[PDB]
Coordinates of C-alpha atoms and ligand atoms in Angstrom, one line a residue:
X1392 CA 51.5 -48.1 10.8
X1393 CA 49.2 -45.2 12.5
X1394 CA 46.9 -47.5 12.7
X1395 CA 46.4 -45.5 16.4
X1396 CA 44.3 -43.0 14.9
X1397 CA 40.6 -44.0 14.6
X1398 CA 39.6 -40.6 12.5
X1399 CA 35.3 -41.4 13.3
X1400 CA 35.0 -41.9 16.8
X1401 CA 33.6 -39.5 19.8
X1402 CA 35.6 -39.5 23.4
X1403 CA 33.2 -41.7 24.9
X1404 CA 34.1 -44.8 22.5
X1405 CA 37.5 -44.3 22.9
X1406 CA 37.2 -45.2 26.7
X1407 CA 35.2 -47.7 26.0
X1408 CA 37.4 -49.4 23.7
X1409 CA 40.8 -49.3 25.9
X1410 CA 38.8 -50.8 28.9
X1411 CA 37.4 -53.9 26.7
X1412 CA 39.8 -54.6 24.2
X1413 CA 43.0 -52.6 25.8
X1414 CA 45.5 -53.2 28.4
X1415 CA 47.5 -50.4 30.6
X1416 CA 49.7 -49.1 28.2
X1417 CA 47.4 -49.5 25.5
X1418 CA 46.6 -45.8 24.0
X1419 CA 45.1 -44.1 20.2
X1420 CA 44.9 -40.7 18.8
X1421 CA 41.5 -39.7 18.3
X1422 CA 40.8 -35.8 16.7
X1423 CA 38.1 -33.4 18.4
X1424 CA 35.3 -33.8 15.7
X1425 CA 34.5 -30.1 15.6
X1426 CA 37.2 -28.3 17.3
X1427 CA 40.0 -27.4 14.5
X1428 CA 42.9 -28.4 15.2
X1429 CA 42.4 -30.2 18.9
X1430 CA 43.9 -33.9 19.2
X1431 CA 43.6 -36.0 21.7
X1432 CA 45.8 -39.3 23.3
X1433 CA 43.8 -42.0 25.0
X1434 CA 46.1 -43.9 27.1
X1435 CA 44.9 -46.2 30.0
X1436 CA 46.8 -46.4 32.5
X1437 CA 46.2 -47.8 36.5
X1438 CA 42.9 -49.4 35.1
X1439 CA 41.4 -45.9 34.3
X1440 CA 42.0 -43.7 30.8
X1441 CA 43.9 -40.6 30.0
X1442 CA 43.2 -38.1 27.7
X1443 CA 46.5 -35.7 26.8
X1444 CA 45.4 -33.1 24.9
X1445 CA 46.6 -32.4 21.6
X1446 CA 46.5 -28.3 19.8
X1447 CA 47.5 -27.4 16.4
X1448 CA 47.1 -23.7 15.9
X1449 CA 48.3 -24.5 12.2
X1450 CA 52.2 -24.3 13.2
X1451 CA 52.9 -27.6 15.2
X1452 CA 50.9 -30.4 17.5
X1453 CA 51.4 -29.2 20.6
X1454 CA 51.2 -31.6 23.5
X1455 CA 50.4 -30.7 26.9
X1456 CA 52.9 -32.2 29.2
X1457 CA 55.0 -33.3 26.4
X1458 CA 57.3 -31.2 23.8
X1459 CA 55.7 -30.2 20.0
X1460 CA 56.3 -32.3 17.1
X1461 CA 55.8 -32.3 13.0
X1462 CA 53.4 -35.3 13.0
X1463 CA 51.7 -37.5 15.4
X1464 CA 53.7 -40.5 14.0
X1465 CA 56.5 -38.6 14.9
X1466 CA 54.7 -37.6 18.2
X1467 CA 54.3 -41.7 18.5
X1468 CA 57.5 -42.8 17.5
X1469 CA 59.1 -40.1 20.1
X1470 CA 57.7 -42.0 23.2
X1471 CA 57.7 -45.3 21.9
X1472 CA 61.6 -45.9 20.4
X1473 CA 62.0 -39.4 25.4
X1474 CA 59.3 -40.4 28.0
X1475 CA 55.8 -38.3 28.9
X1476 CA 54.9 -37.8 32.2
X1477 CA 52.6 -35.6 34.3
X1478 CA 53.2 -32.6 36.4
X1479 CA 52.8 -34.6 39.3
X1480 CA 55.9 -37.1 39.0
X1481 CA 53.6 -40.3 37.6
X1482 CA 55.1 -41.2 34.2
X1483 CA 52.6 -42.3 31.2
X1484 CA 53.7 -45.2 29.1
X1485 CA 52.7 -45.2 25.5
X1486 CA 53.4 -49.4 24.9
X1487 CA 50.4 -50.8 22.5
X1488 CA 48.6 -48.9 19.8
X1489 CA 45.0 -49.9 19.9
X1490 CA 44.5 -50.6 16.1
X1491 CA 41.3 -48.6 14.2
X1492 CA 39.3 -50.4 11.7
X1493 CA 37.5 -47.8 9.8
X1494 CA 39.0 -47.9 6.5
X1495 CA 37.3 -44.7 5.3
X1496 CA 40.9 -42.9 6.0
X1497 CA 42.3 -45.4 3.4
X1498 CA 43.2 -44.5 -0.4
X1499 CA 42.0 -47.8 -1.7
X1500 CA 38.3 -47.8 0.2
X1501 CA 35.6 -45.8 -1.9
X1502 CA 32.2 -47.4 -0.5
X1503 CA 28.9 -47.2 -2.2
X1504 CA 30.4 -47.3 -5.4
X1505 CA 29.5 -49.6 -8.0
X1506 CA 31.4 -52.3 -10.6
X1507 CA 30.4 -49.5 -13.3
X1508 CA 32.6 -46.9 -12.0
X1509 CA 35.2 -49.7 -10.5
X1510 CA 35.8 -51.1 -13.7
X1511 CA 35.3 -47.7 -15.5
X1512 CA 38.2 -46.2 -13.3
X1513 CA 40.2 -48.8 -13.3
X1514 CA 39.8 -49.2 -17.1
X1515 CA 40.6 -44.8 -17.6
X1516 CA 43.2 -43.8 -15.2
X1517 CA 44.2 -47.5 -14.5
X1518 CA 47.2 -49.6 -14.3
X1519 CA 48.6 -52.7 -14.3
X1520 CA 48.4 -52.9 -10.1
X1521 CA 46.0 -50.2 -9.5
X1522 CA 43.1 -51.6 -7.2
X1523 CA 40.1 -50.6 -4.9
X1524 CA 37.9 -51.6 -1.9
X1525 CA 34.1 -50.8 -2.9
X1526 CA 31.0 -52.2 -0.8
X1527 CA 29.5 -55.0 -2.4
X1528 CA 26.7 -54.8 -4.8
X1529 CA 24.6 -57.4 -4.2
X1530 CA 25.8 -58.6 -0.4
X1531 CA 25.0 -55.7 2.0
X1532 CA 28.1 -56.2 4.4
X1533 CA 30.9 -57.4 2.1
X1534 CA 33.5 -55.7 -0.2
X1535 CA 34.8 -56.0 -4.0
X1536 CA 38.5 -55.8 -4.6
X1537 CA 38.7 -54.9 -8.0
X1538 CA 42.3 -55.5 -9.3
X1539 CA 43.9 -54.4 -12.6
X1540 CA 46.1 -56.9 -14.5
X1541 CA 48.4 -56.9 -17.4
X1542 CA 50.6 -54.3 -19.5
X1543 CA 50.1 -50.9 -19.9
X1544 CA 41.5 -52.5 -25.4
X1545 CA 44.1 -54.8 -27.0
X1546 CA 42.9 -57.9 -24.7
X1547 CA 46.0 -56.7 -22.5
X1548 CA 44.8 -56.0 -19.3
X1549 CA 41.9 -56.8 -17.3
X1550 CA 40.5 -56.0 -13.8
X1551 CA 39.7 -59.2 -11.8
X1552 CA 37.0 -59.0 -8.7
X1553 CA 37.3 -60.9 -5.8
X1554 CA 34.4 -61.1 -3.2
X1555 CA 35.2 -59.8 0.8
X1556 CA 32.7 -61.8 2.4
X1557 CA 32.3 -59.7 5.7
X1558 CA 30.9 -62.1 8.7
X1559 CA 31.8 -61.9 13.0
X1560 CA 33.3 -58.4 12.4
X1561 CA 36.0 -60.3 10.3
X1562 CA 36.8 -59.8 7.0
X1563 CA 38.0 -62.7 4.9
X1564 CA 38.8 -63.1 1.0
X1565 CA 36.4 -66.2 0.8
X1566 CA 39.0 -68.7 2.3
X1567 CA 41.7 -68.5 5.0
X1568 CA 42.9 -66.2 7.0
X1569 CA 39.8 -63.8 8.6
X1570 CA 41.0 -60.3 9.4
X1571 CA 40.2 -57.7 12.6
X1572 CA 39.8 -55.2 9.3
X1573 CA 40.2 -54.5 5.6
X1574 CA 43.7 -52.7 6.0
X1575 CA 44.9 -55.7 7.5
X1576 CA 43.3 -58.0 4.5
X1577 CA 44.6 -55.5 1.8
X1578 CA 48.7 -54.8 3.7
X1579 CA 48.1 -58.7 4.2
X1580 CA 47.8 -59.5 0.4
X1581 CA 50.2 -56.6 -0.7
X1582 CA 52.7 -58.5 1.0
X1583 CA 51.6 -61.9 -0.2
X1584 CA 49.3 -61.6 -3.4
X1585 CA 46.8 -63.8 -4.6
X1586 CA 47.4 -66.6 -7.4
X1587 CA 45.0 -67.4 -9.6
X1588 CA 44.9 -71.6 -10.5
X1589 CA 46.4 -70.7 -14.0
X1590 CA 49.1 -69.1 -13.2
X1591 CA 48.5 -65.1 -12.9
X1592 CA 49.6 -63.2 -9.5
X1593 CA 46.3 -60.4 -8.2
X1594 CA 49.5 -58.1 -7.1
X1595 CA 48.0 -54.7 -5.5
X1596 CA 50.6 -52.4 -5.8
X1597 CA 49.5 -49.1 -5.8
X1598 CA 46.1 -47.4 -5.3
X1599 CA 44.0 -46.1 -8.2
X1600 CA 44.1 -42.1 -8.1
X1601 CA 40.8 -40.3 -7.7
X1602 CA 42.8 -36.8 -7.0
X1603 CA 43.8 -35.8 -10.0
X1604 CA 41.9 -33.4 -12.0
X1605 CA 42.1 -31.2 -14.9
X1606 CA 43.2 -27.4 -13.6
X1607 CA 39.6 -25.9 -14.9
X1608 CA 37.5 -28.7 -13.6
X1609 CA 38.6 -27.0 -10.1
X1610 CA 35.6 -25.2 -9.4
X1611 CA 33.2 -28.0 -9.6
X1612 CA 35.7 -30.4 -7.6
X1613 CA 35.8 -28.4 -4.6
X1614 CA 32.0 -27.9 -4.9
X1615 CA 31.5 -32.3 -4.2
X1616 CA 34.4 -32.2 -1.5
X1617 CA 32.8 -28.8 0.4
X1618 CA 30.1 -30.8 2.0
X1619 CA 29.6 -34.4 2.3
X1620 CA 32.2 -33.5 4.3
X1621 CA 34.6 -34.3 1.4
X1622 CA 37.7 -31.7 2.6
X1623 CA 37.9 -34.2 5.7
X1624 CA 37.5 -37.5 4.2
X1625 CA 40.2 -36.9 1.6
X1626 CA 42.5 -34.6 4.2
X1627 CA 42.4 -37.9 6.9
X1628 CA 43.2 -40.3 4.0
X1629 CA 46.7 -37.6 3.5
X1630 CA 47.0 -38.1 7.3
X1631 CA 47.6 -41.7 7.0
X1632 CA 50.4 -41.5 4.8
X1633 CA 52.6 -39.7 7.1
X1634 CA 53.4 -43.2 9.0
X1635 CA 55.5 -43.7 5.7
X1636 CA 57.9 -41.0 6.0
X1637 CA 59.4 -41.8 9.4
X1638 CA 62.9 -40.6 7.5
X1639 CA 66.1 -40.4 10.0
X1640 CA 66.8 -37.1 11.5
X1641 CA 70.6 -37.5 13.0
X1642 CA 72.2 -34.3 12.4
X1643 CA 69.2 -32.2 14.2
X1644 CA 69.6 -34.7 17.2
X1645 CA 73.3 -34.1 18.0
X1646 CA 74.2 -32.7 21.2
X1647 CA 76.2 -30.1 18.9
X1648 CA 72.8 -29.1 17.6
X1649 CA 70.1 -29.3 20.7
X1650 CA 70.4 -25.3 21.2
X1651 CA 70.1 -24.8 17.3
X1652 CA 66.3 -26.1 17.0
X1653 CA 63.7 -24.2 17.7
X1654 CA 61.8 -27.0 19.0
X1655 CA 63.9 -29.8 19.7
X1656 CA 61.6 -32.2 18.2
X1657 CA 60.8 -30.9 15.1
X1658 CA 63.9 -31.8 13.2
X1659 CA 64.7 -32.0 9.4
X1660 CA 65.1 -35.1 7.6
X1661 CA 69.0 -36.2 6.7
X1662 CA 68.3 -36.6 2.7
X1663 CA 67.3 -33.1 2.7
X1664 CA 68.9 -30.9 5.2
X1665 CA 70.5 -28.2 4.2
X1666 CA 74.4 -28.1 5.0
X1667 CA 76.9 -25.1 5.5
X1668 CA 80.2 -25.1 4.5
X1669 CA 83.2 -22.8 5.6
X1670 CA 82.6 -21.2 9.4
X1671 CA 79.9 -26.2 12.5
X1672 CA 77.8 -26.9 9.4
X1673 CA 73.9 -27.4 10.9
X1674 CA 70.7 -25.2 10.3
X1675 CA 67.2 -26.7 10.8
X1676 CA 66.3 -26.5 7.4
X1677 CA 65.5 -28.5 4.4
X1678 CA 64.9 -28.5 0.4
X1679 CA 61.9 -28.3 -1.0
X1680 CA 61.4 -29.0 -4.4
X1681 CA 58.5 -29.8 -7.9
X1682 CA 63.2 -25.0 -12.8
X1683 CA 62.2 -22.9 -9.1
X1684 CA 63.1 -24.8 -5.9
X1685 CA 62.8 -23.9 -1.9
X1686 CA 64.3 -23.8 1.1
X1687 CA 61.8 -24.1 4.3
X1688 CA 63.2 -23.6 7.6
X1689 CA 62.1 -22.6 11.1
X1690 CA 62.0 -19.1 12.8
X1691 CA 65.5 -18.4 13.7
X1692 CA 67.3 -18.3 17.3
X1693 CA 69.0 -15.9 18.9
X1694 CA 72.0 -18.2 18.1
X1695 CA 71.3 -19.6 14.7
X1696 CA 71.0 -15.8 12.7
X1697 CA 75.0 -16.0 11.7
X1698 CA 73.9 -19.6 10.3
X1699 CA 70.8 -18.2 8.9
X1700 CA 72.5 -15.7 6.6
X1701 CA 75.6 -18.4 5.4
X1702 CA 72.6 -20.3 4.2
X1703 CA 71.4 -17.3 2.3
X1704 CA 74.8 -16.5 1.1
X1705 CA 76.1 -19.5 0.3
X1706 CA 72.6 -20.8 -1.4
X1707 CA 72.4 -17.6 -3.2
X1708 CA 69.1 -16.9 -2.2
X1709 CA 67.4 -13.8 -3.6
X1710 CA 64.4 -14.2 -2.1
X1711 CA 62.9 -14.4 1.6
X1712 CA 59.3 -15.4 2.6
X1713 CA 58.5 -14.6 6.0
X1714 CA 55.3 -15.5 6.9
X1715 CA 54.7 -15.3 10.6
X1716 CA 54.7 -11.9 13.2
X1717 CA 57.7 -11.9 15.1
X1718 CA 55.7 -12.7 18.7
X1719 CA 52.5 -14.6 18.3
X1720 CA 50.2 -16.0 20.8
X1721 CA 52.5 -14.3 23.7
X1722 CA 55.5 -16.5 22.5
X1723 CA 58.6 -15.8 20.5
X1724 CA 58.3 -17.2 16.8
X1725 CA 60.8 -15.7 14.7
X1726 CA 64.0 -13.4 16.1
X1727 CA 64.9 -10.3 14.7
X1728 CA 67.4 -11.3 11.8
X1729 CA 67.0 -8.1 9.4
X1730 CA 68.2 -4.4 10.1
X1731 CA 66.0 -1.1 10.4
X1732 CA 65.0 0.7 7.5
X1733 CA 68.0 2.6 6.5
X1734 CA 70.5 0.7 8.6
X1735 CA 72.9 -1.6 8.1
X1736 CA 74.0 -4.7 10.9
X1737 CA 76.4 -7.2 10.7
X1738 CA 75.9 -10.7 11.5
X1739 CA 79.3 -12.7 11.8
X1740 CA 81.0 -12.4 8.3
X1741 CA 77.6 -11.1 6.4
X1742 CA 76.3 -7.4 6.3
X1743 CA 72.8 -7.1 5.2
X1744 CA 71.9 -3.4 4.8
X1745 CA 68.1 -2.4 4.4
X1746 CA 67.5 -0.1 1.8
X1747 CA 63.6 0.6 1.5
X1748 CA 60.9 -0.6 3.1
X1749 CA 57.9 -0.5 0.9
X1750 CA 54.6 -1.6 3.4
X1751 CA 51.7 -3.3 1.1
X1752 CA 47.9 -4.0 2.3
X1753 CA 49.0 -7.7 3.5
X1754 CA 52.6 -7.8 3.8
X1755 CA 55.8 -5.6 4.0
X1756 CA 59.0 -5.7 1.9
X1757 CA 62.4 -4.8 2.2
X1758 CA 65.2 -4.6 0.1
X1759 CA 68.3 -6.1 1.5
X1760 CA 71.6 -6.3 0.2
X1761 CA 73.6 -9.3 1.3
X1762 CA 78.2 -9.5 1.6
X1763 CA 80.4 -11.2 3.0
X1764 CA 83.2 -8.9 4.9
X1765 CA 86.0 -9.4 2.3
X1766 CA 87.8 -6.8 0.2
X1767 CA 86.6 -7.4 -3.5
X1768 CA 83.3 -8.4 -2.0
X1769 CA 80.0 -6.9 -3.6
X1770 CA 76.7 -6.7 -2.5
X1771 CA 73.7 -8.7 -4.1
X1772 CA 70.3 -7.6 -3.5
X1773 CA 68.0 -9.6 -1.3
X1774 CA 64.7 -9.1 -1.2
X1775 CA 62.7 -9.9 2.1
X1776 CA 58.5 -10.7 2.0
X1777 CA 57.0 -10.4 5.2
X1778 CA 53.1 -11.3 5.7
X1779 CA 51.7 -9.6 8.2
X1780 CA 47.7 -10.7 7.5
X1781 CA 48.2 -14.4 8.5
X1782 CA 45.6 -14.8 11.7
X1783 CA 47.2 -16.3 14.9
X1784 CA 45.1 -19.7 14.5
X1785 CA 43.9 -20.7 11.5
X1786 CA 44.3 -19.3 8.0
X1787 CA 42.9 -16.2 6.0
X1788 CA 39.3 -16.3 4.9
X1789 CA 40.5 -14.3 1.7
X1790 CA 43.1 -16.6 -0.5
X1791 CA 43.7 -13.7 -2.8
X1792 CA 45.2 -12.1 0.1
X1793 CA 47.8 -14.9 0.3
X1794 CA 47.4 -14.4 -3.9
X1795 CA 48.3 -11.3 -4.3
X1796 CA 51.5 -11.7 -1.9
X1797 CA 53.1 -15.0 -4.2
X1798 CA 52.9 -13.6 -7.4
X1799 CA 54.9 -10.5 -6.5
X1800 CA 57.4 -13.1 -4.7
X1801 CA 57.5 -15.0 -7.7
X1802 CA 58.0 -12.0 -9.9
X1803 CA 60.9 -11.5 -8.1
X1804 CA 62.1 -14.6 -8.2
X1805 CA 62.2 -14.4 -12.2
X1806 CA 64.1 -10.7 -11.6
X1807 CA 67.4 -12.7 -11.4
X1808 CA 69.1 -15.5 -13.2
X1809 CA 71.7 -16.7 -10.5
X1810 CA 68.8 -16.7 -8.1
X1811 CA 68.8 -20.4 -5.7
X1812 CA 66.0 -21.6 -3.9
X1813 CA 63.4 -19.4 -2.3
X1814 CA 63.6 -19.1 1.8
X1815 CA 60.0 -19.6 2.8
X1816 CA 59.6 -19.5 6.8
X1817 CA 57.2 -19.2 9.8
X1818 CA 57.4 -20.3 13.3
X1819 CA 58.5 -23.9 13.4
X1820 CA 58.5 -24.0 9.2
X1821 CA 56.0 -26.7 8.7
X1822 CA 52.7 -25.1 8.9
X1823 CA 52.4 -21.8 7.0
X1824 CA 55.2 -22.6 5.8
X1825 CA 54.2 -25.9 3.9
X1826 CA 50.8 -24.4 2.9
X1827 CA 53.0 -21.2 1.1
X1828 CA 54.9 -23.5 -0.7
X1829 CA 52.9 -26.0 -1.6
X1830 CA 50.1 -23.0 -3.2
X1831 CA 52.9 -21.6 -5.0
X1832 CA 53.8 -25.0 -7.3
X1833 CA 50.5 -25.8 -7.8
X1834 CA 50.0 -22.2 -9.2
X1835 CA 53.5 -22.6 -11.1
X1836 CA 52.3 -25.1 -12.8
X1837 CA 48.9 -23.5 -13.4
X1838 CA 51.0 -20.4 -15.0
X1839 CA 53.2 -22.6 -17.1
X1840 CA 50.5 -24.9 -18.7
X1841 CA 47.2 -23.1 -18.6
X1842 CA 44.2 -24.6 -17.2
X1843 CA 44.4 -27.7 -19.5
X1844 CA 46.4 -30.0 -17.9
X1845 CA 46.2 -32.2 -14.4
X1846 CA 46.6 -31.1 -10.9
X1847 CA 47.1 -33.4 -7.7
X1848 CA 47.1 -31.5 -4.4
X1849 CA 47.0 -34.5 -2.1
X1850 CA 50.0 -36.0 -3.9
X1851 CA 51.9 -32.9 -4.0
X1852 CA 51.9 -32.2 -0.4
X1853 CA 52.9 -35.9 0.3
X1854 CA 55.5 -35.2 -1.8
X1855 CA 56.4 -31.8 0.0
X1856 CA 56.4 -33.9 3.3
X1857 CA 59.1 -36.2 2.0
X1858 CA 61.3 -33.8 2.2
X1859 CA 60.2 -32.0 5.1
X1860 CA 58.5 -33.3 8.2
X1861 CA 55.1 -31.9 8.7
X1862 CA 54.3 -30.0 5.3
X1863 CA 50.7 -28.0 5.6
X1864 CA 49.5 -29.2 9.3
X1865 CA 45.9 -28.7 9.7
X1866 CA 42.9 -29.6 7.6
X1867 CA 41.4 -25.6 7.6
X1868 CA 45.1 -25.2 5.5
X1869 CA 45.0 -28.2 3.2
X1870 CA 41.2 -26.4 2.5
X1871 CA 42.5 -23.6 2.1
X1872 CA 45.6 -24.1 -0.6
X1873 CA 42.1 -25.8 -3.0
X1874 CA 40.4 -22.3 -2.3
X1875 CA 43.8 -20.8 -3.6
X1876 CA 44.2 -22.8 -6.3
X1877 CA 40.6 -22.3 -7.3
X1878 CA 40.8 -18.2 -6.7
X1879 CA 44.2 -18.2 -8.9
X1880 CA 42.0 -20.0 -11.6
X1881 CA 39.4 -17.5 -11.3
X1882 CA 41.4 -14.7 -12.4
X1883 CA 43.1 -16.2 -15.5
X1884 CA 39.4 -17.1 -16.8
X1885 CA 38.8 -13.4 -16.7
Ligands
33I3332 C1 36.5 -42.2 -1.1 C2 37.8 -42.2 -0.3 N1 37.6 -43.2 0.9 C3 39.0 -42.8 -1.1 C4 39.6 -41.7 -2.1 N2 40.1 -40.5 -1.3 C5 41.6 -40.0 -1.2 N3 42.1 -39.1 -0.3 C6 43.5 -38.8 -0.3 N4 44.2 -37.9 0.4 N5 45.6 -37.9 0.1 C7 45.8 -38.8 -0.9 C8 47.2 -39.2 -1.5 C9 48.4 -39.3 -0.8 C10 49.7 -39.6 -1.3 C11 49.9 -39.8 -2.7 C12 48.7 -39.7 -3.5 CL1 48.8 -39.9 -5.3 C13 47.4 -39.4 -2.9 C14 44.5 -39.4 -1.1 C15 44.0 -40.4 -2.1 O1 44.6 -41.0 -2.8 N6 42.5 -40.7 -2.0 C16 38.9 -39.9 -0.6 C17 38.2 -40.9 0.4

């Protein structure tokens, strides 16, 4: 499972590794080391290698010659269960994924760390299945897998070590099996865990946390992750989660629903798609939730405004968040859906009527009012947040910029009782997007409880991506919501 990605390796490995140990047909995703947001897809093929390029502007993976997907698992998945093929006729056949060994992308795999913080973290934070890969103490080569046992200082638990001798490249336990790498020794004994002679089972089930951290011990956090650097280690280690939310997409595949997507592969998930009754009922978005919920979907078609303003209606949304220009990089992103200033439009059986404009610094806001066509209908005020300062690539060097813009949203939010869920938005509603929503709980959170209580951002973007494909896309974002969350702490300690 995306064991394709080798996240430490240069172009000129890569080559070499699908002409030793690869096949035609044989391909891995390798990133651009310092190129932001530049992938790349090895394939061999006729006894030579390929490399497809891979961009993420921050919005969506774009692959050259294919079609633009949420994730590269997705992008995976997509060719091997469509087909890619050149200009030039010649088709490209993604068959074997080339496994990576590096385990420095893994949650469980620390390195030179030591059985004083192994068994102090897995004595703190710890619990009963919580383990770790460390490199060995005393044996330069091998590996300690710490487990914790038992319960939840009464004798209760304990953490158990057992020795990874590491000899030939393999890495074996200290008896049986020898595997090609440590994610194959650790999935191997998840599956099947060790048994001790007297009777107790070394069962790994989940990895110990080292993400969590108390809201005012941000500043000092980001300072250890901001070079060695840190961002990238702990931003790959989120990338290799995605492979676990593969989640059916149906509804956004039906040929009632091919014109409806914005990009035909980035679909939203079945479990939380957002349905619309009267009227077909289909809209490429999905809910996003931590009470304040969301509603992320993509930049609307030409043919998918009626649909985008039954959602609003019938959700009772009071709040919009656009965060994209209407054309960037010489491309549609995001249809006109809203009226002039001082104008009124109707869009099927809604009438939204602009009432004031009101352009900020960063962004510009409009008040809407929102009705069906209908006698004893009356109008509810909906309140549109467009940001305008987002750059084209990338994200803003200035998070109170992006600051400044979510509190006023989520005043407005609190403005209304019988609000729903907020409608946050971009191009294909992954990229800013995700990054806007996931900023915005992690500072809900901060507001409610202070700065004395535990934030996870790692956790709560995996947690974001469950329920949409592709949540906060490039590293410079995931950076950038911990220089958020760090800025928002800034002002409340003055
Ligand atoms: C030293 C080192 N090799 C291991 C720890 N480390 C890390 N980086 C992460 N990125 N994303 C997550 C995550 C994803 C889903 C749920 C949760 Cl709770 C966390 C995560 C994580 O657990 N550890 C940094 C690199």
């Amino acid at each position: 499972s995306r064991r394709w990605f080798h996240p430490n390796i240069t172009g000129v490995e890569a080559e070499n590794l699908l002409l030793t140990r690869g096949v035609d047909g044989s391909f891995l995703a390798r990133p651009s080391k310092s190129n932001p947001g530049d992938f790349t897809l090895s394939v061999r093929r006729n006894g030579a290698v390929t490399h497809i390029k891979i961009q993420n502007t921050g919005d969506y993976y774009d692959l050259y010659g294919g079609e633009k997907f949420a994730t590269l698992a997705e992008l995976v998945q997509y060719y091997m269960e469509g087909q890619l093929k050149e200009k030039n006729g010649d088709v490209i056949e993604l068959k074997y994924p080339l496994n990576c060994a590096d385990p420095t992308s893994e949650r469980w795999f620390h390195g030179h760390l030591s059985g004083k913080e192994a068994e102090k973290l897995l004595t703190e934070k710890g619990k009963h299945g919580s383990f770790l890969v460390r490199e060995s103490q005393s044996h330069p080569g091998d590996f300690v897998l710490s487990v914790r046992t038992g319960d939840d200082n009464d004798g209760k638990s304990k953490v158990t070590h057992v020795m990874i001798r590491c000899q030939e490249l393999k890495y074996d336990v200290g008896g049986g099996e020898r595997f090609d790498s440590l994610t194959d020794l650790v999935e191997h004994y998840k599956k099947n865990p060790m048994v001790e002679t007297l009777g107790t089972v070394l069962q790994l089930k989940q990895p110990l946390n080292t993400t969590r951290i108390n809201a005012a011990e941000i500043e000092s956090r980001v300072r250890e992750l901001s070079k060695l650097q840190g961002f990238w280690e702990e931003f790959e280690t989120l990338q290799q989660q995605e492979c676990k939310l593969l989640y059916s997409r149906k509804e956004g595949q039906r040929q009632e629903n091919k014109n409806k997507n914005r990009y035909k592969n980035i679909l939203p998930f079945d479990h939380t798609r957002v349905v619309l009754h009267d009227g077909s009922d289909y809209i490429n978005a999905n809910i996003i939730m931590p009470k304040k919920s969301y509603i992320a979907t993509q930049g609307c078609l030409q043919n998918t405004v009626n649909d985008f303003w039954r959602m609003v209606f019938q959700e009772n949304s009071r709040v919009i968040v656009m965060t994209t220009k209407e054309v960037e990089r010489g491309k549609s992103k995001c249809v006109k859906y809203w009226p002039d200033e001082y104008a009124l439009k109707e869009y099927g059986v809604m009438r939204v009527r602009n009432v004031k404009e009101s352009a900020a610094h960063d962004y510009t806001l409009r008040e809407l009012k929102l009705s069906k066509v209908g006698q004893g209908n009356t109008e509810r005020t909906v309140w549109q947040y467009h940001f305008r300062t987002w750059p084209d690539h990338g994200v803003p060097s200035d998070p109170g910029g992006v600051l400044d813009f979510l509190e006023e949203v989520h005043h407005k939010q609190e403005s209304i009782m019988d609000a729903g869920p907020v409608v946050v938005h971009c191009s294909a509603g992954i990229g800013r997007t995700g990054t806007f929503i996931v900023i915005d709980i992690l500072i809900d959170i901060i507001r409610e409880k202070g700065v004395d209580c535990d934030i996870d951002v790692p956790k709560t973007i995996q947690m974001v991506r469950s329920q949409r494909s592709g949540m906060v896309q490039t590293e410079a974002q995931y950076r950038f919501i911990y220089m958020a969350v760090q800025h928002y702490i800034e002002t409340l300690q003055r």
